[PDB]
Design an enzyme around this catalytic site. Structure first.
Site, PDB file in Angstrom:
ATOM      1  N   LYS A  23      15.825 -27.851 -17.876  1.00 14.25           N
ATOM      2  CA  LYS A  23      15.789 -29.098 -17.650  1.00 14.25           C
ATOM      3  C   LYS A  23      14.538 -29.550 -16.986  1.00 14.25           C
ATOM      4  CE  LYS A  23      18.942 -32.512 -18.133  1.00 14.25           C
ATOM      5  NZ  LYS A  23      19.556 -32.483 -19.444  1.00 14.25           N
ATOM      6  N   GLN A  39     -19.892 -26.637  -8.419  1.00 11.92           N
ATOM      7  CA  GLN A  39     -19.841 -25.622  -8.247  1.00 11.92           C
ATOM      8  C   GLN A  39     -19.849 -24.725  -6.916  1.00 11.92           C
ATOM      9  OE1 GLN A  39     -21.525 -27.111 -10.726  1.00 11.92           O
ATOM     10  NE2 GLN A  39     -21.205 -26.356 -12.799  1.00 11.92           N
ATOM     11  N   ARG A  47     -27.248 -38.370  -4.416  1.00 12.41           N
ATOM     12  CA  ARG A  47     -26.174 -39.011  -5.196  1.00 12.41           C
ATOM     13  C   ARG A  47     -24.867 -39.215  -4.552  1.00 12.41           C
ATOM     14  NH1 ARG A  47     -23.994 -34.487  -9.756  1.00 12.41           N
ATOM     15  NH2 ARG A  47     -23.197 -33.004  -8.160  1.00 12.41           N
ATOM     16  N   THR A  78      21.779 -27.585 -20.561  1.00 17.29           N
ATOM     17  CA  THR A  78      20.557 -28.228 -19.692  1.00 17.29           C
ATOM     18  C   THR A  78      21.127 -28.945 -18.305  1.00 17.29           C
ATOM     19  OG1 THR A  78      19.965 -30.001 -21.110  1.00 17.29           O
ATOM     20  CG2 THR A  78      18.967 -27.977 -21.506  1.00 17.29           C
TER      21      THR A  78
HETATM   22  N1  LIG Z   1     -22.202 -30.605  -9.675  1.00 17.20           N
HETATM   23  C1  LIG Z   1     -22.432 -31.040 -10.970  1.00 17.20           C
HETATM   24  N2  LIG Z   1     -23.306 -32.022 -11.306  1.00 17.20           N
HETATM   25  C2  LIG Z   1     -23.364 -31.930 -12.810  1.00 17.20           C
HETATM   26  N3  LIG Z   1     -23.860 -33.199 -13.195  1.00 17.20           N
HETATM   27  C3  LIG Z   1     -24.067 -32.764 -14.597  1.00 17.20           C
HETATM   28  N4  LIG Z   1     -23.935 -31.286 -14.802  1.00 17.20           N
HETATM   29  C4  LIG Z   1     -23.461 -31.094 -13.396  1.00 17.20           C
HETATM   30  C5  LIG Z   1     -22.678 -29.771 -13.146  1.00 17.20           C
HETATM   31  O1  LIG Z   1     -22.478 -28.982 -13.645  1.00 17.20           O
HETATM   32  N5  LIG Z   1     -22.484 -30.240 -11.534  1.00 17.20           N
HETATM   33  N1  LIG Z   2      20.656 -29.293 -28.358  1.00 16.75           N
HETATM   34  C1  LIG Z   2      20.925 -29.255 -27.140  1.00 16.75           C
HETATM   35  N2  LIG Z   2      21.681 -30.130 -26.552  1.00 16.75           N
HETATM   36  C2  LIG Z   2      21.776 -29.546 -25.144  1.00 16.75           C
HETATM   37  N3  LIG Z   2      22.505 -30.580 -24.144  1.00 16.75           N
HETATM   38  C3  LIG Z   2      22.619 -29.858 -23.161  1.00 16.75           C
HETATM   39  N4  LIG Z   2      22.020 -28.458 -23.163  1.00 16.75           N
HETATM   40  C4  LIG Z   2      21.570 -28.672 -24.553  1.00 16.75           C
HETATM   41  C5  LIG Z   2      20.601 -27.552 -25.096  1.00 16.75           C
HETATM   42  O1  LIG Z   2      20.184 -26.429 -24.841  1.00 16.75           O
HETATM   43  N5  LIG Z   2      20.465 -27.873 -26.480  1.00 16.75           N
END
Ligand SMILES: Nc1nc2[nH]cnc2c(=O)[nH]1
Ligand SMILES: Nc1nc2[nH]cnc2c(=O)[nH]1
Ligand SMILES: Nc1nc2[nH]cnc2c(=O)[nH]1
Ligand SMILES: Nc1nc2[nH]cnc2c(=O)[nH]1
Lengths: 295, 295, 295, 295
Positions: B10, B228, B176, B57
């Site tokens: 779920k 980096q 920058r 589920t």
């Molecule tokens: N810090 C950083 N600025 C960037 N600007 C363009 N490429 C990079 C990169 O790899 N690192």
């Molecule tokens: N098809 C299907 N419907 C559900 N409704 C609740 N659980 C299930 C599941 O495992 N399969």
């Protein structure tokens, strides 16, 4: 057929501006998203393929950058007034400019209990916005707002006494979770032009801070009878604090958290006074609005 | 053909839990999104339409609620271990449980300079996550992480000395903007079972706080030679602070802010040392990763 | 500490390419999103601030444009092999290239029962993707996939016979709605290099068309005993149709549509055989996976 | 202060309805998302905490299900009129109902060149919507629309002759890519009530099909002088085909695809007449609107 209404312009223009204090070495950043739509004598661009009346959307984008370069970008109500005023004065056939600005948060980082000179963090997705309509001969209309403010209180919220008929299954309650995304807008009294807006500059940021604070305090302290009742109280307070505001508008979703009955499993008690585990519901949601003005 | 691998369960189970201190009246909320996928002897459900091996589920969803009701949901590394352990012990033919948890922020509101007893605000979209794999006879593998931490520094970031050939147009720079969304994961040493995880409980929250703090301080203070170089420094520090961590992994986008040349407009100066207005770029973006472990 | 793994490159590079038949006047457009991550002898960029080993991410972006300019961009399995091969041959210290491509649909418009020469429409958000890993001395590994294929059948789907214990509340059913978003991946046998990939070119598009068709036909015709059973049948057929495929992997959400009991309202009958109005549930959802290979 | 305006209701109510032909065995599904906001004499819920005037949003949700159960959900203009009319007739103090409906596509699958009786596929994210305002004593106002229709033409689009001044850098062009997401709305003449809407039923689907077809044909065939000129032509045709429409409104983004100059790389020619590889731009984008009515 005829053109009843027309507007065109540039949307989603992202802008960043940095302010550097040479004295202190302190840097301040501003980031926003801008939309500008124009109206005027442009019908022929639609009807006759006459592009001579068109100020290219790309030029509008250029203008936003240039304007941001030559003027302060804060408070946004001022920057938007400058930008809209520019289009109507510069172009003879353009008579209205509609400028929308969304301000993104970049909050100074605190490192070691102290404000950092040039490092910022986005704390939440809450926005501060402005809508500015600059109409030739009718001044400047400004609506300011805050949105994306998400809050929840786990108790002190009630909902009982509502209408009951054959369509009702909802049970009255005296204790519930209240959660919402706050969208609050305050509309300013019409301004005669830029000089008048410049005269009220200090009121913009203060009124924004006030709306926020009142919103947060009222939500936290009110023993809420309903979303309707709590929102009216907020709006009432904002209007009383700032005379230059004509109307306050709130738009609030009611995000539901349902109790989960676990009694089918070993008599486990998880409802009413024993409720601990809830299921937040994605949809549907209540939507509650109200516009409050002066009597 | 044959089934080489299979898992089912779920996803997107939203859970909210409130803790009420009867003494102080203070309430604490926890909100999370849970995924649980199971593996075991379930091939026949695929090959022979034999549903007898299937734990529905919907039952898995029920179990998450029940487990949350009877146990603490924090720290998430513990709650996830309890939940996964439950499926492998309860069901003879289920041999692995994979539990993913995303914790959403609900931060106590401060009203009037004081913590409010039951009102909360979502400050940013930053998450704390856990991935827990509970495998019968192989203990418990936990990877904890923080993600969605968005930061920017307006200066003290450089990038020069990189390879240059006929595909290069990028100019070397000594100043920058550096902006990114931090995704950091620390992998714990394998645990023998629940009793061992329970013994290390206090280390989870502390190590999370440590990773965050080191990440923020290193980003703000490093005169960055490259993404980096800065990320390796963070990972080096986390490993040195917590011995029970085997590897630190960082995954960082480089969100570009381009200078806007405005000199075509009245010789306006907006590049290099005169740069004030930038254009944030939505895409493309640099993506830089590194896994750092112990020598 | 030491670098255990490292990769870096450019993500979200949007590319559009148009093909113009001078003969017929017919135009064909291709739009994709590309990610390229490199590995090799680049540890020192992290450990010693030595940027001399770095092929700038901006150069990688330039290279994608140039490669797209000089080569066919279709089928994507070929374009990705060319692009990855380029980095490992060009740079001595780069030993692996990981290239991910997402193809967006631009479907020729039919105007007046006839194919338009240069107008296109996006029909759905379904993607065709490729993941290509080009490792020096280990050839070329390709995984092709289709995703975002959303389907629903209103009947001929069952789910009964599953395990029942004290955690079960789900009722067995003989008739239900089945809806899902299909994510199917087929992994090709390892290729020795580009010349081998070029030799199999025609098989890429045909195998993609086959996976899609089998997926759609099996979903529509199978009287489904479970999602598990229906997905295995699809994967079984794909493997039987294309020998060069080593494994088929399916990942399927079960998007639930709940019956709404309306009997509390004037005895209105809307359950079981009388069910007409359902509530689609946004979350949670079942998640069912399986990897099928050759015995 | 006083309440100047107020509306409240339920949003994001997902609804699915199946129609089963007992004769043919053919099944038809309808899926939509509904919003209903009410207005009336509800001020006291805000001002006095008087919930007696409130029809619970949960009851509004119940009502949508019940209404969908007892009435046809197609065409949406009819279903929305029935739903809004219900609230104003049932509740004495409710005087306006605002109903918004979004219809999602579930398109019958073709298996082996033949329509499948009960299997469907979502072909694109294009929506058909309706906005219905039902005001006591003022009849029924309906605005129908289609949105999310994404198209592109690779040639036969121009943009030259626009205003040029010191803010302009955009170059005139005689050949460009034109791409957009179509949002078209047609407003019907006011209807006196439900009986009148029922009388025009057949015109809804036909007018929707017409707007779509005219939109697609005009986009594909027009040698576009500008977005403005092309959209006016569409709106002109829709108005001429259906007299019961008062106004047509178009709202179109201009999604830009920039040429990439590759001449810095070995004199590679990729501009003007040699342009093959483009860079789709995510933002910003032109936004062009126009409302066309009858002279
Ligand atoms: N810090 C950083 N600025 C960037 N600007 C363009 N490429 C990079 C990169 O790899 N690192
Ligand atoms: N098809 C299907 N419907 C559900 N409704 C609740 N659980 C299930 C599941 O495992 N399969
Ligand atoms: N506060 C509040 N809660 C509700 N729950 C259902 N309807 C309502 C409403 O109108 N207001
Ligand atoms: N069609 C069109 N293209 C543009 N490019 C820049 N501005 C415009 C505009 O207004 N219309």
């Amino acid at each position: 057929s005829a053109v009843k209404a027309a507007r065109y312009g540039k949307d989603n223009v992202r802008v960043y501006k940095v302010h550097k204090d040479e004295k202190t070495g302190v840097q301040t950043v501003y980031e926003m998203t801008v939309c500008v739509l124009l109206e005027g004598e442009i019908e022929t661009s639609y009807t006759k393929a006459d592009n001579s009346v068109i100020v290219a959307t790309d030029s509008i984008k250029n203008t936003i950058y240039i304007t941001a370069k030559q003027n302060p970008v804060t408070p946004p109500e001022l920057f938007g007034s400058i930008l809209g005023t520019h289009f109507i004065e510069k172009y003879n056939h353009i008579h209205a400019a509609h400028v929308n600005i969304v301000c993104h948060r970049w909050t100074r980082m605190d490192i070691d209990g102290k404000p950092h000179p040039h490092s910022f963090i986005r704390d939440s997705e809450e926005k501060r916005n402005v809508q500015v309509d600059v109409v030739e001969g009718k001044g400047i209309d400004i609506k300011s707002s805050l949105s994306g403010l998400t809050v929840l209180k786990s108790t002190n919220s009630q909902f009982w006494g509502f209408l009951r008929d054959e369509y009702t299954t909802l049970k009255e309650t005296w204790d519930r979770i209240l959660s919402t995304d706050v969208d609050a807008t305050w509309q300013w009294k019409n301004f005669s032009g830029l000089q008048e807006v410049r005269s009220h500059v200090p009121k913009f940021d203060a009124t924004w801070a006030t709306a926020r604070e009142v919103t947060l305090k009222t939500f936290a302290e009110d023993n809420s009878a309903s979303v309707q009742a709590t929102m009216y109280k907020m709006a009432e307070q904002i209007l009383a604090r700032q005379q230059l505001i004509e109307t306050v508008e709130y738009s609030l979703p009611n995000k539901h958290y349902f109790e989960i009955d676990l009694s089918w499993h070993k008599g486990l008690q998880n409802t009413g006074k024993n409720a601990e585990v809830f299921a937040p519901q994605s949809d549907p949601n209540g939507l509650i609005k109200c516009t409050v003005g002066r009597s």
